[PDB]
Design an enzyme around this catalytic site. Structure first.
Site, mmCIF file in Angstrom:
data_model
loop_
_atom_site.group_PDB
_atom_site.id
_atom_site.type_symbol
_atom_site.label_atom_id
_atom_site.label_comp_id
_atom_site.label_asym_id
_atom_site.label_seq_id
_atom_site.Cartn_x
_atom_site.Cartn_y
_atom_site.Cartn_z
ATOM 1 N N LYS A 197 0.807 -1.239 0.000
ATOM 2 C CA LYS A 197 0.000 0.000 0.000
ATOM 3 C C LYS A 197 0.838 1.286 0.000
ATOM 4 C CE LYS A 197 -4.130 -1.919 0.058
ATOM 5 N NZ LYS A 197 -5.022 -1.998 1.213
ATOM 6 N N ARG A 232 -4.220 -9.581 5.301
ATOM 7 C CA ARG A 232 -4.309 -9.817 3.865
ATOM 8 C C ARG A 232 -2.913 -9.466 3.351
ATOM 9 N NH1 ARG A 232 -5.408 -7.284 -0.964
ATOM 10 N NH2 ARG A 232 -6.660 -8.518 -2.437
#
Ligand SMILES: Nc1nc2ncc(COP(=O)(O)OP(=O)(O)O)nc2c(=O)[nH]1
Ligand SMILES: Nc1nc2ncc(COP(=O)(O)OP(=O)(O)O)nc2c(=O)[nH]1
Lengths: 251, 247
Positions: A197, A232
């Site tokens: 991210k 995740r």
């Protein structure tokens, strides 16, 4: 004590569990076999960013033969329907079960669902909606609302995910990370996904998304310290190794 | 708090990294390795020439030490021999890393004479203790006092993970690391690539233990440690960027 419902079995959350990502966006049974070998507890498949069926279903059917729980990352009910029909064990909805059709499928197939947060369900306009007066308060309110709704409609169980990197400025992602314990306090299993991210690239100084494993592991361990038991991730092995150490120490 | 480095002080308001440069077989590419570690964010360079094997063979350390010191970055010299330390210190070394825990009065004297901080690491090897934590703390404290009373400007304590310690011992020390930090001295640890990491992460090859090592070090950081002895500087730099912004 805590467990995660996976259609036909319960997964212990006495230790951190990993959802290994298998992205089918522009046979992968082999990448699926490797992730399991690396320690993935659940395989998260997604052709999101019908053509979705064409890409996802064929693979989904092949991966399911491994006997490992499979989570399907999709926001379209037509996809979810067919995904569960084949045997999917978990529904991962980035739009947070805003669609009743999604809630219905979950309760009908007796499968738990992940309620993730996005300020608006439209990926193309979410960044124009990152203006929370109090991001932590607002995300908690949304998560708790979607949860109660889903649970009353027959959904077996719901997993909450603050949705890092979805309609959130760095300032917002940071606030949620630092107060992640408040989301865990809502009583539902919490799932986070910081792998690759922008937040990680920003804090670790790494521009290349595929080179952010060290920062991602660091953010994930912090989340685990805050009570998160589901992650995740993309690099399954890196997290299994890190957790092998972390869980022996912090406990 | 800060760490004295001979002629300058390093603030411990953030975690500092001691990049390891092993000068043993068990040349010039070493300087290139040092420059790389400096580029990756290493605050101090820890050069060692003896696996933890003979004093004469200073040909291992000194030449490199002198070349590395030209990078301006503080240098730590990992030696247990007074003769080596003396020569290393006269050349400009900024920190004395002694694995034998300053047991040798000559190293204490030298550290004090050159006004240089010294790392007191614990090492008994025979891995048997009545109470490893209590025993390691008592040893570290006693040596630190011996050193300060002799004029050593400052002392850094290090429990010496892996040195005469089985998994159970390393686990106990890690879990109660806060008690060592509570002694009032800066604390240094080094688990990079050590057996403990291999055991807990299930990684056979020491060269592939970075993920388990980073996890161990972050736990130490959470316990109050602000100095880490590492091999993969970049990995730690990236992980700490995230960790320190969150914690
Ligand atoms: N529950 C949940 N689902 C998600 N799906 C996609 C992405 C964003 O990942 P992305 O950059 O698109 O990469 P990839 O989908 O390959 O993991 N993040 C999440 C998340 O954070 N939580
Ligand atoms: N202060 C201090 N000095 C040390 N020197 C050597 C080793 C053992 O490290 P090793 O696996 O042999 O690798 P290397 O010596 O090349 O760094 N560990 C320490 C330590 O833990 N603390």
């Amino acid at each position: 004590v805590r467990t995660l419902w996976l259609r036909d079995r319960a997964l212990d959350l006495d230790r951190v569990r990993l959802l290994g990502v298998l992205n089918l966006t522009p046979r992968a049974l082999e990448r699926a076999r490797e992730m399991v070998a690396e320690g993935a507890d659940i395989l998260d498949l997604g052709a999101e960013s019908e053509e979705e069926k064409r890409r996802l279903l064929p693979v989904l059917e092949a991966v399911l033969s491994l006997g490992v729980p499979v989570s399907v990352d999709t926001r379209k009910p037509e996809v979810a329907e067919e995904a569960l029909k084949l045997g999917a064990h978990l529904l991962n909805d980035v739009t947070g079960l805003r669609d009743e059709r999604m809630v219905a499928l979950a309760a009908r197939h007796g499968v738990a669902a992940v309620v993730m947060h996005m300020p608006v369900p439209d990926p193309a306009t979410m960044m124009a909606h990152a203006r929370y007066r109090d991001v932590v308060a607002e995300v908690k309110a949304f998560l708790e609302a979607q949860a109660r709704r889903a649970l009353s409609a027959g959904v077996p169980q719901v997993v909450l995910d603050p949705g890092f990197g979805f309609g959130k400025l760095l300032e917002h992602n940071l606030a949620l990370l630092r107060r992640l314990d408040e989301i865990v306090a809502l009583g539902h299993p919490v799932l986070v996904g910081l792998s690759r991210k922008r937040t990680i690239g920003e804090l670790s100084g790494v521009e290349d998304p595929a080179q952010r494993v060290h920062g991602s592991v660091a953010a994930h361990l912090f989340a685990v310290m805050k009570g998160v038991r589901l992650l995740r991730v993309h690099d399954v092995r890196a997290h299994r190794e890190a957790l092998g150490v972390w869980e022996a120490l912090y406990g």
